[PDB]
Amino acid sequence: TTTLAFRFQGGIIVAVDSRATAGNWVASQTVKKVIEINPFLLGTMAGGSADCQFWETWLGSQCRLHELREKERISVAAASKILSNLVYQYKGAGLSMGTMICGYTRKEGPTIYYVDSDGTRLKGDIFCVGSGQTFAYGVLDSNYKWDLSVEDALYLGKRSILAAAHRDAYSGGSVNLYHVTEDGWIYHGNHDVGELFWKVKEEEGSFNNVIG
Amino acid sequence: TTIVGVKFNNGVVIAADTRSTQGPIVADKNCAKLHRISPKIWCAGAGTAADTEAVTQLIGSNIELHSLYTSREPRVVSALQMLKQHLFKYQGHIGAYLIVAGVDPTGSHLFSIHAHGSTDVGYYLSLGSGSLAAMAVLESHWKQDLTKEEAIKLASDAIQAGIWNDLGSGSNVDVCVMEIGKDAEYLRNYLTPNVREEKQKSYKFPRGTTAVLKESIVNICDIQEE
Amino acid sequence: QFNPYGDNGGTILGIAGEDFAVLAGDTRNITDYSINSRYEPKVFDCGDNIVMSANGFAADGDALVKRFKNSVKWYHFDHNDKKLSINSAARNIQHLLYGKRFFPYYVHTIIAGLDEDGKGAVYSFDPVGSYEREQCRAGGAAASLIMPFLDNQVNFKNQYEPGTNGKVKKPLKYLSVEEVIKLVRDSFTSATERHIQVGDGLEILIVTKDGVRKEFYELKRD
Amino acid sequence: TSIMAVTFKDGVILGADSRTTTGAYIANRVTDKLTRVHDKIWCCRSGSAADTQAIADIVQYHLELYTSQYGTPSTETAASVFKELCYENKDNLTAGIIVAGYDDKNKGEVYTIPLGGSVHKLPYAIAGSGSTFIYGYCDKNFRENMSKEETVDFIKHSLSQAIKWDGSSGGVIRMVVLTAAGVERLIFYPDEYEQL
Amino acid sequence: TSIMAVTFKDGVILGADSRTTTGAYIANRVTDKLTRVHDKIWCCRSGSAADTQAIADIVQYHLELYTSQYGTPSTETAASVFKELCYENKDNLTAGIIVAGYDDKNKGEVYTIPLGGSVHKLPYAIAGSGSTFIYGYCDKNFRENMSKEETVDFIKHSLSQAIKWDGSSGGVIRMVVLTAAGVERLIFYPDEYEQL
Amino acid sequence: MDIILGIRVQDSVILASSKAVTRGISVLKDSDDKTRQLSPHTLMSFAGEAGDTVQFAEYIQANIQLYSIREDYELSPQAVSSFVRQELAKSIRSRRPYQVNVLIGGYDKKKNKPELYQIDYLGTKVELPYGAHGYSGFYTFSLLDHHYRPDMTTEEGLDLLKLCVQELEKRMPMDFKGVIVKIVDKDGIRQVDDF
Amino acid sequence: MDIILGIRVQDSVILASSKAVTRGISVLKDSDDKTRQLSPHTLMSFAGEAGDTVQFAEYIQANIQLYSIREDYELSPQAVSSFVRQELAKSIRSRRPYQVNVLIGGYDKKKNKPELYQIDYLGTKVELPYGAHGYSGFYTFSLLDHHYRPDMTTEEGLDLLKLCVQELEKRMPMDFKGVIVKIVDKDGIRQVDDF
Amino acid sequence: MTDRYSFSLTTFSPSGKLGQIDYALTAVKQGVTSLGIKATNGVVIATEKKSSSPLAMSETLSKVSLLTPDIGAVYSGMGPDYRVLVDKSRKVAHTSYKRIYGEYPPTKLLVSEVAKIMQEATQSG
Amino acid sequence: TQQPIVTGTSVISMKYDNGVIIAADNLGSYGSLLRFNGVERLIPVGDNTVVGISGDISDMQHIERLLKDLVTENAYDNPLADAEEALEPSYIFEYLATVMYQRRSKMNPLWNAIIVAGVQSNGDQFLRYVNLLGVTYSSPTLATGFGAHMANPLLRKVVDRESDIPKTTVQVAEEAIVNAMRVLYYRDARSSRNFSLAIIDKNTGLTFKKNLQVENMKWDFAKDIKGYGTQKI
Amino acid sequence: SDPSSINGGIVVAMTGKDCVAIACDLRLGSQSLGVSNKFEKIFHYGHVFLGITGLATDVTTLNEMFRYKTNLYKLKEERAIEPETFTQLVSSSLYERRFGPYFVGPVVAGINSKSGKPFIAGFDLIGCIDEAKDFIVSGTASDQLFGMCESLYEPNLEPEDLFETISQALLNAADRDALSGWGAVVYIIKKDEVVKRYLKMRQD
């Protein structure tokens, strides 16, 4: 798995791979590692797939109940903390979770919280989680700027997943892109890594090591 | 694996299935489990397949040299004694489980050999994962003074019991008949009750379906003259 | 020490068509190297035009199918005989499975039917309830033998149009129910040849707007 | 396994069941556990079949080479060779052997060699998993200088009970009679000994 | 431990050795393993002394409360109470109990309850570590409808052999006779039974 | 987390705490503030197992803030440290103990004295002139033993703290990404933004 | 030891190797050169278990120097790398295997080409444009995949190497105390003394 | 004891002759005639069974010996030396070939192995 | 979690044209000790069902009491207890199957393998298996433990599939069962010669046969077998 | 930990009409980390071709070993080794390390130069010969290859048809295995010409 999310001028980019493996066996190439918690909040799926799926759609239910009671959009801080407090109750039981809770509100602006099954809750600008996280971090760190355009930020997230997909054996399949704005997230398509790799190799002149 | 050995009037018959497996996967659907130690001494192996093939060749080799040295046709008891002393020395680490059968100037013989080096005598024997299925058939139908035709029938029926009921065994039945005063007759694929049915579809591709990057001629020939 | 789990082998296959869906499974039930039954139905009609199979440990498989069938019944009682849509059934099954997160149903569950637009639908679950809608999914013992074949023959993966040499992919043309059944049968024939736990019989449940239909085929019994 | 050897007036008789098991599966129901190391020196084998066969074969070799040089060996000599192998290789052997033989000078003698490799000369000896159930019976019923027919009955009744209670024992009761007259093999089937 | 109970013409007799060991140390050489749960319902105890005492005490309580309400309990009823405790608490108990009793309607009855908590009604029963050595002897020598003197001799000879071979058994042979006539205790010392 | 230091000088308490947050293979953050303000004149730094650290720290914070509202009064550093110790001492025999070590730096407005308390996850409390948790003390205490004076100024304390951090940066294998330094005195709590 | 990188550019091979030597708790040295010159145009860097690394490297060095004297001839980098692989492949089934991973950077004077070989302790040899051992590749390969060109100059190679080292210094938990960089080309082996 | 003859018993004489080899060839010369003829579809090898006594059963003395199923050997000279060479030739066909390649050696290579054994008896201690 | 102490071995069974046959030996083993020789392991429920149980005997006796209690309970406020509302094999099985799976799910199993053999109200043959794991399956032939390995192969030669059931008479079926029991006596070290056999027929009802013995045994060939290889005497 | 699945990779061989085909992926890895996309697993000694999957150091070592042995074979025999003979040599060589084996899954392919008969063979790590008529598979996606080969294969395929069958068998099997892929090579072998084709595949 490779999942990333980073804050920038235009909001948040969320990018993930699509591969699921059981040992060396590739179980699926069409997995959704971005949970659509609600139209404004996104969560990434790493570690236990069920644990992420189950508890983040549950989180969506809690967020819905909040805004029904309080007549106001839940903050990313509050939404993330509901999840982190929950998993912290289960600490020791064997939940496996590494997720970025991503959202864009009035009071906070674009906000990303890394939430962990050990109970860790970190606010940050750039997060990268999974077996291919180190590969994606490299591309991110060397190319990231706050004043990235929405177009360039989307490409950076896509390219960083590709970097991981290539090297990390347990990452690949396809790239899912999301752009999170204040008015909600916008889906930016599924991109097959096989086709994307050759396309990027040619247009970018990268991956000279690989014969195409 | 299902392997059996059955004594009869004027000799002995051994039989085996033809499935070799790697875990739950069938590696070879028509494996030859009936091995030759000498022209008229044959054996069937179960357990570690390399160990069975390896130990039969080694003893089969030393048996041939012994036969040449002594100017006498090889005896089953010699193969038996050499196999067991070898296997015992290695304390079961050579995972060979054999049913040894054959004819020699002493008569017709049937023995089993386990990997730790113990041996047993009998009129009917079975080994392998399908040994219990086969032994059930042998215990139900075996009698004294079987004919050649009855023993072949019994042996193959016992292998079939393994083929159908044991997941470790399958495909075909191999048989070898060793009768006194005769050449041993190896009957490869004596029964073939597991032919695959015709598929619903042909999966022959149109030519040019596969994407290719580079073609080149490989030089298999030696360095050329001139 | 007592081991509450076991492996009853078996292999199941779900394929979603354009206006239909099939859920197939072999009828062999096993423990270790023994056959328990040559015909033990594994794919079940659960009502509301939904078919289900929970492959793996048969006791947990039977328990889950039973509880889901029960959930369909109570969905009718509680919600004025409303039809349980395939997507709603899928979410319900997630909760059944995740309910036993820390002592899981040791099964790989697949359901099939039609979505609310009448198109073919297959959902695939892991043992603890993570699920996804899929076009094509083999589960069980010979899943690794079947899925690559399906990637190639259903989705036309690695296949390109002759003459173009890798530039144009083979187009993803829609398969009929007769075409799917051929691929299912050939998948199971091949799996039977190379996997010891697969054989005896193949039972296919076909779901259309007209209802659920069954087809049975013999498999090699060795 | 149920095995025993009993001295009597005319010599000694070895007795044994015929069951060999791999767990609960009877691998061989007609096993011959009475094995010959010399003309009138035999042994009963218990423990590892591989080990006891390997030992017996080596002993037979040693007594064959002994005979070529020094003439017929004593039963004591055979027991000593068995002991030497069992004792010196105790770490790698699981063998419980009863040695029985007939001299003309010494007559019937029985030596038991348990796991450790120790030697014990006895009037009679019992061994194998099934022997545990007949310590009481054999101790109460054994007499010295029994007749051939009495000793056969004593062994037959003893192993019958051993077989009855021990699942590891069963099949036929084999016996070998060692006297001045020669070597006589006896066999007794389930229908005979079960009704005793 | 060597324990047994034997039905005969006039009722039933319980028998037991008196040795209790902690490893190889004999903690008590004059133990009373024959314990009373009702006037004419006794039991033989084997396994954990703590467990079997605790069980027996609870049974005695249950049969005392039963008697206050419903009159004298059957031997079957006593065995059922023993079983209920042993079966339901099988994970935390190491108890092998033989239940023996005398009704006037049913006469002498024997029930054995092994480790698992199962119940087996038998003409006679043997149990404890020393019982293994006398399965052969007891099976060969037991007859139904023996006299009091014959049954005493049968138990005395049986436990003598059990004691002879089992190091865990020894000391005196205690017995308790249950008949219409009443309850008679018997004791037999080493000098008596060893020479048998 | 990793390194947390504390030093009580003449008129203030200084707490230095590393900025790194490492998830096994990668350093996920290099600006993490491992501290919570319990009351206007009481600051608590913390280090231990992930999740437990922040969960515990915020739990303490909430309780002290609750007390501050109920009584309209700020508890003395000593009182706060005793409360914290008890919570950890209670925790150590629990089903799943808090794996958290803390330093409590406070200025007692009644006594007009700075106070530094060191408490480990077992509930082992000690009042010290300077303190640390984990391996931090091993590198730094020899320097603190040498240079420390009870009449040091805040500026001198910071200089001695820099020397301690330099020694850590030299001899520690781990990159803890520098430290956030905070000062607790009569005027309250403030952060030294350049260190 | 920890991080060792290698990059083959147009006309040279560049090897970067960390300077830190850590004995569990303390960093004992911050200037360690984890490399040996096998021949005038062949350099080998190394990382693995303590003692074994230097023992192996010097053993190889001695053998190549012996060969160079006997034949009055420098072995090709390919020949040296094959010899090294065999020694490690022999080692892996020994009583106590060498736990050593190496990079062999050489300039083949016959072919006038730079050559970089990566060999692990199992004897797994691969010729690469750029390589690493341990976790170093995980951080750096995504950058090298992106920027690398076979026609890079030595100066461009060093710049790409700096970017790799910067990424390591940012995201690695361990402080590896920078790297010693060496260049292998037609003129031989030289060290970049400012990096 | 121990074989203390660790030095060569065959050595070059001043004239360059290896005496013991020459003398061995002299022993061969005295030996009974044997021959070999190669045809297009076969080979024949033949010799005389020189019976040392009429009471001796000359069928028990095999001068012509099977080495492999497709290779045979005949000799002239010292019979006992031949017999042991046949034993070694048969074994070496297995150990240094059949147990490696799963087939019997070609004629030339078996001959090569026999030659090697004979060469070593010409130089070894 | 426990370990079985006193155990019962194979239960074997098969369908025939008009009903089902089931058989099991009368032995209660205590490890390798053949402790109890008079244990009935076929327990009839009414006149239409026979439950065959292998494995732990104490748990068998418990199950036996549950079934006895089940009959009592079914008769309560049930005027048709001996008619339309009598216990069916399918009811008895499903109940046991529920209990077995519940008990494994509490990590405290009934250490058994059970075969419920019977005939339904409509005359249909009922034969289904359940064990300590709560695993269930049905087949024309069913067998537990060693029976699965040795009996099934023999019984499957008579009824290899569903279509062979109407072609199989009660005489042929019983013969095959009795032969299988002999084979198990030859080869299962934890078996006894004495066994019980029950036939449940839709016409002739429940026939329960006690004190049966394995007969027509082949042992004579043992006399010729000597040594373990080279020995002649 | 498991030596046969550290480096990953696959080999497949097939027989056709008067031809054999052998193919392999190009991946070498350190578990999850991809290390090389040029690690060929097929070698040849004269006209006999040998694929080797498993632990990469052993793959290299055995190739160097069989080059060594087939070179001496040729000098002494004065002819190139045949597939049937070489198969026995591979078996012999593996079994001599019975209690310290090379962690490999070798696959022999070739055409007997005298009879013209197409030949393939497979081995376990310890030397047991699998001489299948149809196809041999090896590596970390052997299950997948078995599935592909079993359905796609038909006997007596012409060289250019066999190429498509083996290529599609390899590719789709490798795409279902995390530790296989990163390029592929297919050898089409006829009695006196051998064509080598590098396939275009996804690089993840």
Ligand SMILES: [Mg+2]
């Ligand atoms: Mg199959």
Ligand SMILES: [Mg+2]
């Ligand atoms: Mg041994």
Ligand SMILES: [Mg+2]
């Ligand atoms: Mg018995």
Ligand SMILES: [Mg+2]
């Ligand atoms: Mg892959």
Ligand SMILES: [Mg+2]
């Ligand atoms: Mg990848």
